[PDB]
Amino acid sequence: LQHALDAKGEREVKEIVINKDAFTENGQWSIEHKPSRKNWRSDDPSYEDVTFYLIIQRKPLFYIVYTIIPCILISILAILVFYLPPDAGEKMSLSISALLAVTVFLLLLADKVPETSLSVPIIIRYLMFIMILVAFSVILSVVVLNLHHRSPNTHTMPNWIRQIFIETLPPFLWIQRPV
Amino acid sequence: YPDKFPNGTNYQDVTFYLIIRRKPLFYVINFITPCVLISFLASLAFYLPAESGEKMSTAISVLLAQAVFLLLTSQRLPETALAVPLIGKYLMFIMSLVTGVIVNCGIVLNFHFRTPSTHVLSTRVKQIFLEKLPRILHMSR
Amino acid sequence: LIGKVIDKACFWIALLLFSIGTLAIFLTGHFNQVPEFPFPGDPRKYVP
Amino acid sequence: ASEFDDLKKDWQYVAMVADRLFLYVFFVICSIGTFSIFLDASHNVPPDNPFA
Amino acid sequence: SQTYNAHEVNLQLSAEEGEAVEWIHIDPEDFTENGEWTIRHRPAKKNYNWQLTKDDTDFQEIIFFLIIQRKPLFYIINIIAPCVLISSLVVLVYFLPAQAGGQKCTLSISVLLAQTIFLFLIAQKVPETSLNVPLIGKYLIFVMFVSMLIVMNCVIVLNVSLRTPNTHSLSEKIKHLFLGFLPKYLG
Amino acid sequence: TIDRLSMFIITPVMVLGTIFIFVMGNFNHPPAKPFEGDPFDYSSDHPRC
Amino acid sequence: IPCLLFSFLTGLVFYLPTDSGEKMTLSISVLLSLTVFLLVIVELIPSTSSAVPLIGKYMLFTMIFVISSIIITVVVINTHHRSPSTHTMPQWVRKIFIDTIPNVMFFST
Amino acid sequence: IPCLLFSFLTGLVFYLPTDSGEKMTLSISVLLSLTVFLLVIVELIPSTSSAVPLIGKYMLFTMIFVISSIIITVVVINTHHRSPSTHTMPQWVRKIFIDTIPNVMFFST
Numbered sequence: 034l035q036h037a038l039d040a041k042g043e044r045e046v047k048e049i050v051i052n053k054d055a056f057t058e059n060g061q062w063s064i065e066h067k068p069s070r071k072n073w074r075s076d077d078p079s080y081e082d083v084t085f086y087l088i089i090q091r092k093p094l095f096y097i098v099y100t101i102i103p104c105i106l107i108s109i110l111a112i113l114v115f116y117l118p119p120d121a122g123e124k125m126s127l128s129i130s131a132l133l134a135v136t137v138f139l140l141l142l143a144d145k146v147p148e149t150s151l152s153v154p155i156i157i158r159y160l161m162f163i164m165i166l167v168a169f170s171v172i173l174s175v176v177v178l179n180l181h182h183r184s185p186n187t188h189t190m191p192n193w194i195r196q197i198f199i200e201t202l203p204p205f206l207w208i209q210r211p212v
Numbered sequence: 213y214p215d216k217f218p219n220g221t222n223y224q225d226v227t228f229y230l231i232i233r234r235k236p237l238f239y240v241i242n243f244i245t246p247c248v249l250i251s252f253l254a255s256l257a258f259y260l261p262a263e264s265g266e267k268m269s270t271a272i273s274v275l276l277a278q279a280v281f282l283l284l285t286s287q288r289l290p291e292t293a294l295a296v297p298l299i300g301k302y303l304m305f306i307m308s309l310v311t312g313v314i315v316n317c318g319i320v321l322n323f324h325f326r327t328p329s330t331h332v333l334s335t336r337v338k339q340i341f342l343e344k345l346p347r348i349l350h351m352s353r
Numbered sequence: 354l355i356g357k358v359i360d361k362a363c364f365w366i367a368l369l370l371f372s373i374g375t376l377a378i379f380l381t382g383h384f385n386q387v388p389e390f391p392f393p394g395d396p397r398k399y400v401p
Numbered sequence: 402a403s404e405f406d407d408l409k410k411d412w413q414y415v416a417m418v419a420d421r422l423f424l425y426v427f428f429v430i431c432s433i434g435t436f437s438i439f440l441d442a443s444h445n446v447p448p449d450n451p452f453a
Numbered sequence: 454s455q456t457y458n459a460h461e462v463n464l465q466l467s468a469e470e471g472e473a474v475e476w477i478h479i480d481p482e483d484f485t486e487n488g489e490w491t492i493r494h495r496p497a498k499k500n501y502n503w504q505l506t507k508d509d510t511d512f513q514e515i516i517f518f519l520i521i522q523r524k525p526l527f528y529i530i531n532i533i534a535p536c537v538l539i540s541s542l543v544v545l546v547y548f549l550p551a552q553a554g555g556q557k558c559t560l561s562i563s564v565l566l567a568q569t570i571f572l573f574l575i576a577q578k579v580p581e582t583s584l585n586v587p588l589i590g591k592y593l594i595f596v597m598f599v600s601m602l603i604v605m606n607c608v609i610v611l612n613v614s615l616r617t618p619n620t621h622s623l624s625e626k627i628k629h630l631f632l633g634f635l636p637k638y639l640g
Numbered sequence: 641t642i643d644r645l646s647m648f649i650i651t652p653v654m655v656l657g658t659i660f661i662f663v664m665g666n667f668n669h670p671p672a673k674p675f676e677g678d679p680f681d682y683s684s685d686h687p688r689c
Numbered sequence: 690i691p692c693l694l695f696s697f698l699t700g701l702v703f704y705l706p707t708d709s710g711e712k713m714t715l716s717i718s719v720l721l722s723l724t725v726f727l728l729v730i731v732e733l734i735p736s737t738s739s740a741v742p743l744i745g746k747y748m749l750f751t752m753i754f755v756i757s758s759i760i761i762t763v764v765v766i767n768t769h770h771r772s773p774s775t776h777t778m779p780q781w782v783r784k785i786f787i788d789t790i791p792n793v794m795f796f797s798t
Numbered sequence: 799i800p801c802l803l804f805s806f807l808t809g810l811v812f813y814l815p816t817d818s819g820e821k822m823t824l825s826i827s828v829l830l831s832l833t834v835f836l837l838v839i840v841e842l843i844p845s846t847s848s849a850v851p852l853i854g855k856y857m858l859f860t861m862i863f864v865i866s867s868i869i870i871t872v873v874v875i876n877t878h879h880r881s882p883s884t885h886t887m888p889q890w891v892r893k894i895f896i897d898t899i900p901n902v903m904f905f906s907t
């Protein structure tokens with residue numbers, strides 16, 4: 034086995050040939066390299082093949098428009114929930130609806146991700162990151178509401194909570210209440 | 213094809229072209245009209261009084277409906293990357309405006325629930341939000 | 354107090370309705386069993 | 402009633418302060434994680450020598 | 454036979470040791486059961502179409518039957534039990550307070566939404582014929598109609614519980630109808 | 641007041657953006673001539689020779 | 690049958706008093722259920738563009754019915770939390786909705 | 799992992815005070831998220847009836863866990879909004895839930 038020669042045959046062609054008159058670009062894949070090399074096997078003297086390689090880069094616009102922008106908007110909501118006042122009562126609604134939306138996005142992607150177990154794709158890592166972040170937003174919103182609905186008939190304020198949240202933190206966070 | 217030679221099999225071909233336009237009616241009925249009329253409601257969220265506890269629920273449910281239309285649309289086109297379909301462009305634009313409505317409602321709420329024990333009513337904020345803007349927006353008394 | 358009496362009565366009606374419907378439907382399913390003979394009117398079992 | 406009110410307002414103030422803290426913490430964590438993932442994804446290009 | 458008629462070939466069943474084999478043969482040792490279907494009966498018979506003659510090729514035929522029962526386990530675990538347990542929540546609305554904050558409508562309409570998702574899940578599994586309605590779809594229609602009745606009951610109890618003298622007049626006929634003997638005959 | 645302002649700002653952008661985006665797509669017609677640099681119509685009703 | 694159910698529910702919202710904070714919850718949840726049912730309609734109905742089927746005309750009637758209910762609910766809620774400090778009841782509204790329909794209304798209490 | 803997350807959240811509802819009217823919102827929305835994730839399970843997992851898988855036993859444990867949380871939450875809400883006039887608190891509940899438990903617990907405020 035050898036390599037094919039060029040049109041005016043003097044020299045070998047060590048790559049995949051593409052004819053511009055007949056070639057349809059893929060639309061999802063850019064061909065970066067296309068070499069060609071003979072391969073042997075030291076254990077098998079009778080083996081010889083001619084392999085053609087196609088190094089191809091994916092164009093991810095579809096996945097950007099259908100997965101990353103919605104997740105950025107969900108993360109914006111999950112940070113917004115801490116700006117709400119507890120007297121509004123729309124806090125659990127915001128947090129848990131964000132969770133339901135991330136579940137819908139997971140459903141959306143359930144049919145488009147490779148089903149191999151040698152690694153986890155970065156897009157699924159990003160989705161699980163956002164999902165766990167929304168979950169922790171839910172947990173801390175519950176904690177905030179619990180602290181907000183406390184009263185002397187049920188709880189007595191300890192000293193470490195008072196020190197940390199009435200003297201140490203407000204000066205940093207620039208939230209000193211009116212004297 | 214003059215770059216090739218008449219002694220090969222790549223020099224000649226007869227091609228037949230079909231230019232076909234899509235009749236948009238299925239999509240106009242099952243996707244566009246529902247999505248546009250559900251999306252308009254997120255702006256009606258700005259007319260609900262704050263003393264109702266449903267300003268946020270309305271806009272967030274509109275965003276969940278949009279996420280269901282996004283799931284439906286994601287299944288009809290190829291995953292090519294030469295352009296963004298007009299439908300996906302509308303989807304991203306409308307979902308980002310609904311997200312902005314949700315954030316703006318959260319800010320209205322934050323300002324509504326302020327009390328002398330936690331915040332101060334600036335004379336500046338009383339100059340902007342209490343006499344000039346109302347008169348410009350032509351609001352009741 | 355008027356609405357609390359309505360709920361208690363309507364509770365006792367809704368519980369019965371849901372339970373009886375569920376049980377009837379699914380016990381019909383459970384009782385749908387294959388006949389005993391391959392051909393109804395035949396007294397043979399057709400087995401080796 | 403005034404005394405009960407003051408002691409309930411202290412709890413509400415604690416809640417508001419914890420809320421502002423959590424807000425900043427979540428903003429920082431979200432930004433950092435999102436950027437680190439996006440940079441990791443942007444620096445994944447094929448090499449220059451196909452090694453073949 | 455696709456070519457020959459009853460004047461040419463005579464189709465019969467096999468007879469081993471003098472006794473006919475009127476059944477499908479199944480190796481008891483090596484046979485692997487399906488996964489969803491259990492074989493109850495496996496008979497076989499020679500049939501004739503009497504609308505035809507012995508000059509046709511479709512007058513005689515050997516038929517093998519397979520009467521199979523279904524293993525309803527995937528459906529019980531993934532659909533039946535989740536949907537029954539979720540639809541049983543609509544009776545908890547009668548113990549919630551009839552005021553702003555009880556969330557009687559929240560709970561009932563959310564159970565309806567969950568049933569609407571179970572409709573899509575079943576929609577992907579049921580046969581598409583139109584001679585009878587399946588049992589699963591019949592049960593879904595039943596529970597969704599019960600959920601709608603309980604939503605209407607929640608709306609009527611909230612309407613009654615939030616009435617005021619400025620809006621409605623409470624009459625002695627009512628008070629005597631609901632606060633004289635009915636609570637006694639009830640709770 | 642912040643709410644009346646957010647209305648008088650968000651609602652126009654939403655209506656005008658929807659109208660624009662969909663009218664733009666409604667006016668997308670095939671070029672009415674099969675090949676750009678060619679006056680022929682390639683129609684069965686009007687052969688060239 | 691689901692579309693029939695959703696239309697009846699779309700009508701129920703108008704007997705729920707605004708004092709409870711659940712009119713928008715109810716309306717918008719009916720709309721959400723209908724939007725999730727759209728997934729079953731799209732899975733089952735034929736996706737052809739020769740004409741609009743009768744089943745599709747009915748689905749779209751239900752959609753606009755729900756959305757109109759939601760809009761009118763927001764106008765009812767706004768009319769209820771109306772502060773006298775800023776809005777004075779006009780003479781036509783006080784004549785039509787206090788001294789005419791109440792009396793005309795027969796099936797009532 | 800999503801099922802683990804949903805179970806951990808399913809326990810959280812018991813730290814949410816009844817004063818806020820959002821216990822049912824949280825519980826039922828967790829249930830809604832689990833019901834939507836059931837479509838993902840039914841899509842990814844093989845659909846066989848030879849036996850119950852371990853992943854399916856876990857999904858049904860999570861389901862029954864959520865539903866039990868909802869029932870006991872409704873009993874907590876009912877015990878919270880209990881009118882004093884009618885229900886005269888009995889001695890055994892008063893002794894148990896007022897004298898012994900508050901003291902036996904320590905990691906509390």
Ligand SMILES: *[C@@H]1O[C@H](CO)[C@@H](O[C@@H]2O[C@H](CO)[C@@H](O[C@@H]3O[C@H](CO[C@H]4O[C@H](CO[C@H]5O[C@H](CO)[C@@H](O)[C@H](O)[C@@H]5O)[C@@H](O)[C@H](O)[C@@H]4O)[C@@H](O)[C@H](O)[C@H]3NC(C)=O)[C@H](O)[C@H]2NC(C)=O)[C@H](O)[C@H]1NC(C)=O
Binds near residue numbers: 395500501503
């Ligand atoms: C699963 O499905 C199969 C069908 O795919 C079911 O099988 C059916 O089971 C029925 C009940 O066991 C059978 O009914 C019995 O049929 C036989 C034979 O009937 C045929 O011959 C009749 C007589 O023909 C003479 O008279 C005619 C009229 O004068 C003349 O035209 C003709 O030339 C002859 O002189 C004929 O009248 C009839 O129309 C048939 O052609 C009867 O003898 C029995 O009395 C029937 N009843 C019973 C209780 O056995 C039915 O034949 C059979 N069909 C097939 C295709 O095998 C099976 O039962 C199902 N299993 C389940 C549901 O578990």
Ligand SMILES: *[C@@H]1O[C@H](CO)[C@@H](O[C@@H]2O[C@H](CO)[C@@H](O[C@@H]3O[C@H](CO)[C@@H](O)[C@H](O)[C@@H]3O)[C@H](O)[C@H]2NC(C)=O)[C@H](O)[C@H]1NC(C)=O
Binds near residue numbers: 072086088447452453
């Ligand atoms: C794409 O995949 C192919 C096949 O898996 C890769 O080709 C293989 O690459 C390895 C590493 O470069 C080669 O091994 C090396 O071969 C040279 C030959 O002179 C030797 O000197 C080195 O010590 C080493 O053994 C291997 O021969 C080569 N071919 C095959 C068929 O395996 C290729 O590198 C991959 N390309 C990229 C960009 O990853």
Ligand SMILES: *[C@@H]1O[C@H](CO)[C@@H](O[C@@H]2O[C@H](CO)[C@@H](O[C@@H]3O[C@H](CO)[C@@H](O)[C@H](O)[C@@H]3O)[C@H](O)[C@H]2NC(C)=O)[C@H](O)[C@H]1NC(C)=O
Binds near residue numbers: 229231671673674676
């Ligand atoms: C439908 O597709 C066909 C091709 O499949 C289009 O015909 C081809 O269009 C290209 C681009 O317009 C033409 O190339 C041009 O050629 C001229 C002359 O050499 C040059 O000056 C331009 O820069 C460009 O390269 C090509 O000649 C033409 N013909 C063929 C046979 O390929 C056709 O226009 C398309 N129709 C529509 C309505 O889009």
Ligand SMILES: *[C@@H]1O[C@H](CO)[C@@H](O)[C@H](O)[C@H]1NC(C)=O
Binds near residue numbers: 217219
């Ligand atoms: C085809 O024609 C070209 C140009 O004259 C020439 O170089 C080539 O050798 C020819 N091929 C054959 C097979 O004759």
